[PDB]
Ligand binder design. Structure first.
Ligand SMILES: CNC(=O)c1ccc2c(c1)nc(-c1ccc(Br)c(O)c1)n2[C@@H](CNC(=O)OCc1ccccc1)c1ccc(OC)c(OC)c1
Ligand SMILES: Nc1ncnc2c1ncn2[C@@H]1O[C@H](COP(=O)(O)OP(=O)(O)OP(=O)(O)O)[C@@H](O)[C@H]1O
Length: 478
């Protein structure tokens, strides 16, 4: 199996996480689940940045030690990801010795190589300085040879113009004004600053410089680092320069999605425009929360949350469009055939030829959207197919057909096409929604996991034997 390595940024637990953080982790999970469905050996990482004066200050104010405070915050963050059914293979913490060892070794290496020198940085304090300008041509050469490195492509030309063209100043990579962080082994009054400390989580979590580097040699380089747009230059400039200084392979892609806005702009702990994901999940369910996030933030753009948009998106798309379609279909199979779904024979009805083609066009277009990080376009395309399936009930009028015994075969064809249309949608929604597809597969009585995979969508009409649907249907949402 080809490997695929995906990461979110490590988040700062100076306060509780809100749906902005949730977006990145769900988006990372959508990509991870999608890539596992394509047959990749996937590793998916997330974590926490646990150092700096600010974390020590929060712990003191809470009347706790730094790790005591951090363990409670991280417990809540882990609980949240377990609630969101995030499929992360590991959780990296910068307080862990596996991480601290790498920060220590990397800082001492750069010191030995002459990359780092002692100096002074009113903000007036001593710091080690990283000579990054000597990697400039190498970085710009790498951009030329990897034109899809920054996503969206717009932000690459901002990097070069705003930060590189003026010239990369020597980066201050340590401080002496705080003590909560990784102390430099050579010179312990210095503490490693955020730049080296936070960035190396992506490789420290894979056991880089440990006695077992198997995860590192299997998964590095990262296929995709995802983030919000404001930490892209860390990741586009400083990160590959550090990787050059360590003679390490650079990541393939950095994706910088937009922000989840509120009425007053960016969702943030400091604007007091926070929506707690726990609340949305507890009231409206997991799928509604996951769906809203991925559907409402387009590629290369920002999106806005309002309570009115949320319930609209939840009720119209999930509960009505997909939800009624499933109930309508299972009702009719139970009423006209006593729960026995007739086997698919072929495109018997006149609309079936184009609807079957539409199903395959839906899969192909979905694939293109997913491969180009256009998640909202992928979802909207699946909903056009769901809408058309509801419309196919209205066009065919199965209740009229059920009165003529001569049209029993045609009526069975219509039932089969609804269930197969539903099946196509359920397979395609598996990366996004973790409850509804499984609920749909169980209610239609698809136990075999061969019906739930992407390769089962290559040819329309996989059910040639008659099967029995559920006699006691239920709502799929919340
Ligand atoms: C209102 N909040 C505040 O006062 C605050 C806000 C953030 C604060 C903070 C205090 N203290 C720190 C801090 C200080 C020293 C050490 Br050692 C450390 O580990 C953290 N930060 C960090 C938070 N880390 C973070 O967001 O990691 C993202 C990331 C993930 C993966 C790879 C790379 C980067 C911070 C510091 C400087 C920044 O840029 C100038 C910055 O911009 C993103 C963030
Ligand atoms: N509004 C948001 N939209 C999208 N992603 C976000 C948002 N808020 C946080 N994130 C995710 O978390 C990462 C770090 O976010 P950031 O430091 O801006 O959040 P914060 O907790 O709101 O900070 P602060 O209140 O100090 O400004 C981003 O790179 C992104 O992965």
């Amino acid at each position: 199996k080809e490997t695929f390595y995906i990461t979110t940024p490590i988040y700062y637990p100076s306060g509780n996480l809100h749906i902005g953080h949730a977006y990145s982790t769900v988006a990372g999970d959508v990509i991870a689940r999608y890539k596992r469905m394509q047959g990749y050996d996937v590793r998916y990482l997330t974590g926490t940045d646990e150092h700096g004066q600010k974390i020590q200050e929060k712990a003191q104010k809470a009347g706790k030690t730094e790790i005591e405070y951090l363990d409670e915050m991280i417990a809540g963050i882990k609980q949240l990801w377990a609630k969101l059914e995030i499929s992360n293979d590991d959780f990296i913490r910068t307080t862990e010795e596996r991480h601290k060892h790498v920060v220590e070794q990397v800082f001492e290496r750069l010191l030995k190589q002459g990359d780092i020198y002692l100096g002074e940085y009113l903000v007036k304090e001593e710091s080690y300085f990283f000579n990054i300008s000597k990697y400039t041509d190498r970085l710009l050469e790498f951009y030329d040879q990897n034109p899809d490195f920054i996503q969206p492509p717009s932000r690459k030309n901002e990097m070069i113009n705003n930060f590189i063209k003026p010239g990369l100043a020597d980066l201050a990579v340590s401080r002496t004004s705080f003590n909560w962080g990784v102390h430099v082994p050579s010179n312990p009054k210095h503490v490693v600053y955020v730049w080296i400390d936070a960035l190396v989580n992506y490789i420290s979590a894979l056991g880089y410089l440990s006695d077992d580097e198997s995860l590192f040699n299997k998964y590095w380089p990262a296929d995709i680092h995802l983030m919000a747009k404001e930490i892209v230059r860390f990741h586009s400039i400083i990160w590959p320069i550090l990787l050059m200084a360590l003679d390490l392979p650079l990541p393939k892609k950095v994706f910088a999605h937009g922000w989840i806005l509120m009425k007053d702009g960016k969702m943030s702990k400091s604007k007091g425009n926070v929506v707690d994901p726990n609340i949305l999940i507890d009231r409206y369910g997991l799928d509604a929360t996951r769906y809203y996030l991925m559907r409402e933030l387009p590629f290369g753009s920002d999106g806005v949350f309002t309570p009115e948009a949320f319930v609209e998106r939840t009720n119209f798309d999930l509960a009505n469009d997909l939800g009624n379609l499933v109930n309508r279909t299972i009702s009719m199979v139970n009423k006209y055939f006593d729960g026995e779904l007739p086997a698919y024979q072929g495109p018997l009805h006149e609309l079936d030829e184009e609807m079957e083609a539409m199903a395959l066009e839906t899969v192909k277009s979905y694939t293109e959207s997913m491969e180009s990080l256009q998640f909202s376009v992928a979802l909207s395309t699946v909903w056009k197919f769901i809408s058309r399936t509801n419309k196919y009930i209205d066009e065919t009028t199965p209740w009229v057909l059920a009165k003529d015994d001569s049209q029993k075969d045609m009526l069975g064809n219509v039932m089969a096409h609804l269930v197969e249309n539903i099946r196509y949608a359920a397979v395609l929604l598996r990366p996004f929604l973790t409850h509804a597809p499984k609920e749909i597969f169980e209610q239609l009585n698809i136990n075999n996991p061969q019906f739930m995979e992407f390769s089962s969508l290559e040819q329309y009409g996989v059910l040639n034997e008659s099967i029995m649907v559920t006699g006691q249907p239920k709502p799929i949402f919340p």
